[PDB]
Amino acid sequence: SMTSHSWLCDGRLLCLHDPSNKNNWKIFRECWKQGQPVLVSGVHKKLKSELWKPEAFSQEFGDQDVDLVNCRNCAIISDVKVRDFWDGFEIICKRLRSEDGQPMVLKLKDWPPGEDFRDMMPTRFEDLMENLPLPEYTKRDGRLNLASRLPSYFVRPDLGPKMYNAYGLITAEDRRVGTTNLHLDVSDAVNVMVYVGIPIGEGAHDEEVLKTIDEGDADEVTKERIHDHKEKPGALWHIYAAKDAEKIRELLRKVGEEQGQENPPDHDPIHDQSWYLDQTLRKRLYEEYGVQGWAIVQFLGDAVFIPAGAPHQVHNLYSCIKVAEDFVSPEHVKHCFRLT
Ligand SMILES: O=C(O)CCc1ccc(-c2ccc(O)cc2)cc1
Ligand SMILES: [Cl-]
Ligand SMILES: [Cl-]
Ligand SMILES: [Cl-]
Ligand SMILES: [Cl-]
Ligand SMILES: [Mn+2]
């Protein structure tokens, strides 16, 4: 039977089932006021699927110059053609190779650049903005989005959306690395998985994706959604409550010290965006600081709602295209205020 919603993370995460249901706000707003993230699927069924394919981005924009990041060692690959990224998205034998002769796990940096998404891609902009869930919160002019309504005493978000494009992490050693490192945003955000690429050549990558999700602390219901082979898993997230940010900073200052970093006692390891919390660091955070997070597997068409101030990190399981919009809910406006 069709249902309005279900629970993940042992009851701690709301999962809404119908992205366009006008009653979603009634269930959403209680979880959101408590500082929890929220998951919505089925957003892929609302989109024009031909607009969000890697082959179309290559054909239409392939000649633009970009930088890439090597996710395994953070090296920057400067001033290459965006087609050099898109043509290896799902075919491993087309990927740029590191000096060891291995195909690289790459992230496309700042593309489209700054606030240019709407200008470069007006049909994609329309298709996304018209199908965002919780539209009173997430649209530029939604009645519960204060972005356009606030004075300069508040940090306002950039004009979005922003697109996040990266290959999936592959090996047992890749389990300890992030696609996006631990950081926080002063605005709220919704992140939609619009495309998941499951590769070929080295296309027998069944078991290590399962081990990554299990070691990632994914709940029993999430594990049932994986065993059921009906939906493509894109990325593993860890999200922490905004109120736990300083305890995470204390852990990371202590680990930096143990590892011989030489850092002023006030320096901000979350703002540095230099850490990924692996299985060891997540266990230590729980045991030594009493901090529990949310381990979330974002499937194709899942929209992840990230509360303002909530530290978070992303680990791609397969090749992903994600599109994110920032907004300012009245529930969390304190996080962007410039005084006390
Ligand atoms: O079980 C595995 O192979 C590893 C995890 C996983 C789980 C599900 C899929 C999948 C689902 C729907 C589909 O059309 C194609 C693929 C892929 C990967
Ligand atoms: Cl809060
Ligand atoms: Cl377009
Ligand atoms: Cl709404
Ligand atoms: Cl990063
Ligand atoms: Mn973020």
Residue 140 belongs to domain with CATH number: 2.60.120.650
Check if 160 has its Cβ closer than 6 Å to any atom of ligand 1.
no
Count structural domains, the chain: 1
- Report d(CA 216, CA 226) in Å as an integer: 13
312 known member of a binding site: yes
DSSP H helices in the chain = 24-33, 54-61, 82-86, 117-120, 122-129, 135-138, 207-215, 220-227, 245-258, 269-272, 279-289
Q: Enumerate the β-bridge partners of residue 40.
A: 16, 303
Among candidate residues 146, 114, 138, 151, the one with its CA nearest the CA of residue 43: 138
Chain-centre distance for alpha carbon 120: 22
Q: Which residues contact 108 (CB under 8 A, 6 or more apart)?
A: 66, 68, 82, 85, 165, 166
Among candidate residues 238, 213, 127, 112, the one with its CA nearest the CA of residue 164: 112
Count CB neighbours of 88 within 10 A. Answer: 21
322: helix, coil or strand? strand
Residues 274/329/136/47 CA torsion (nearest 10 deg)? 0
Q: Give the closest residue (by CA) to ligand 1 atom 1.
A: 206
DSSP state at residue 229: T
- Report d(CA 201, CA 205) in Å as an integer: 10
| Positions of E strands within the chain | 5-8, 13-16, 38-40, 65-70, 76-81, 106-108, 162-166, 180-183, 188-197, 233-239, 294-299, 303-306, 312-316, 319-327
227 known member of a binding site: no
- What was the experiment behind these coordinates? X-ray
| Phi/psi-derived region of residue 163, left when phi > 0, alpha when psi is between -120 and 50, beta in every other case | beta
List the domain range (segments joined by +) for residue 172. Answer: 1-340
| Residue 250 burial (C-beta neighbours within 10 Å; 0-12, 13-18, 19+) | middle
Sign of CA dihedral 171, 177, 178, 179: negative
CA of 11 to the centre of ligand 1 (A): 25
